[PDB]
Amino acid sequence: SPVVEVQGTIDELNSFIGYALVLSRWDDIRNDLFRIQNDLFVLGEDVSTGGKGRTVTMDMIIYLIKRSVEMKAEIGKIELFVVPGGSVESASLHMARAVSRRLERRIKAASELTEINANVLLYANMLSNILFMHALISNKRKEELDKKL
């Protein structure tokens, strides 16, 4: 079943996000990642049950958007064609973002075969964006710390 594949990809993304959270060195990033793990539990419940149980709310999407706006303000101009890596934190965040993109693809494939709420796909897209922002923030802060020395 496509929903089984979506749930498995959600679990894999949750594992990757937990690894990145372990590697993360900043309070805001770790809080965002923990909230994202809880929201991934919610999103898996929404996808598996078809919306009968807990569902992805617009509030979670708006929280992701607000965090993305704050991190965009902190970062400034974003360069195109960013090479993933730089630091172990940023590399783990990039791996989590790649898994999140795979989850988006799995959700898009599953929605063509069964009913899935649009908030699930919207949250997945915002999750990929916020993981990219987390990686950029980690790289920028690491560069600032290196320039301090």
Add this chain to the structure above:
Amino acid sequence: DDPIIEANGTLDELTSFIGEAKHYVDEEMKGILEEIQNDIYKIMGEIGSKGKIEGISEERIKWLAGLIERYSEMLPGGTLESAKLDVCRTIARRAERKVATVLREFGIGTLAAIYLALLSRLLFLLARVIEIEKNK
């Protein structure tokens, strides 16, 4: 191409009705509705270009969320202005459905869909706020 045309037409209808309704509200709500019209123009530019032209940003969605939070503390058509805003809200819901259809077909317009959902919520809140203030 047909979903793109339908979404752009519905957004054009929405912005025309908002332009009609902004002449019945006060200066603050009129400016809010004009900014909403500019955002709708950006969304139409993105959708008609199939994502080639950059559309709205997350800052606009944050602005909508802030307006919703500010106005949330405070039969359709209790007043004439409230009726205009309710008509705009129904058209915004239809535009949200069309943009959701476009997103499924082409994968462009996640931020637009979020903005349209928040816009329908904001239009409902603005109609209720107008009713409350006129009654008060």
